[PDB]
Each structure stands twice: as structure tokens, then as C-alpha cells.
């Protein structure tokens, strides 16, 4: 494992905590989501952004919250505002921008001196 590996696993752990039902944990089907492909042409999920961190993708943190980005930003797409998956991609959205953001990754950046 290679440090950016550590920190966007330390990073994606946070975030899946956040949802204990695995909703986010695997792509969703066309068969538990009718016409989800039809709507949804960039699918993104956690399974899949670990497979990324694994397999060392991810170039940048700034790459990691794009994937993260994409997958809220479908759900609250494809859902409609009074569903659960629309509310927790809108919690789990704001809690990892916060936890990634800039005045964090600049406080980071500075003890990498
Ligand atoms: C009902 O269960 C699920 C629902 C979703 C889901 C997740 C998201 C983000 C979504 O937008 N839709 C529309 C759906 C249907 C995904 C699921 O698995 C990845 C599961 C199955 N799990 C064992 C809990």
C-alpha cells in the first residue's frame, strides 16, 4: 500500500460509515431501480471507488471526490427529494465535502513539511 492509497481508504472508511444499509455499497441494478441505466449513464458507487484505491487509479484526492460527487449527485437524480436514497446521498454528500475540503487537505498539505 502506497500512502495515497492509506489516506483515500482512511477517506472512503469515513464515508461508508455513514451508510450502514449499503445502499452506496454496490452498483444499482436496472432490476431493484427500473430504467436506472436509462437515467444514469455514469454509474458510481463505494464498491467500485475501492476497487479504484486498490488497483491505485486515483491520482489525486481532488479525483476521489469527483467519483464521490457523482455518486450522490445520481441518486438525487434518479430519486426524488422525499425518498431515503435522496436525503442520505444529500447527508453523505455535505459531510464528506466537509471532511475533504480544502481547509482540511491545506492543513494536511502543510504537515506533509
Ligand atoms: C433496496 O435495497 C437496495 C437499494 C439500493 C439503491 C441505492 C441507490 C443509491 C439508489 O439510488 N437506488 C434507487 C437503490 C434502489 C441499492 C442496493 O444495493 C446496492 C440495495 C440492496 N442492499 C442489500 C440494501
Do not use: W
Amino acid at each position: 500500500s502506497t500512502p495515497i492509497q492509506q489516506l483515500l481508504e482512511h477517506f472512503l472508511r469515513q464515508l461508508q460509515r455513514k451508510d450502514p444499509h449499503g445502499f452506496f455499497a454496490f452498483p444499482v441494478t436496472d432490476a431493484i431501480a427500473p430504467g436506472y441505466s436509462m437515467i444514469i449513464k455514469h454509474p458510481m458507487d463505494f464498491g467500485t471507488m475501492k476497487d479504484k484505491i486498490v488497483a491505485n487509479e486515483y491520482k489525486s484526492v481532488t479525483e476521489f471526490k469527483a467519483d464521490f460527487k457523482l455518486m450522490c449527485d445520481n441518486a438525487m437524480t434518479y430519486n426524488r427529494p422525499d425518498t431515503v436514497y435522496y436525503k442520505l446521498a444529500k447527508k453523505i454528500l455535505h459531510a464528506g465535502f466537509k471532511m475533504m475540503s480544502k481547509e482540511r487537505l491545506l492543513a494536511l498539505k502543510r504537515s506533509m513539511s
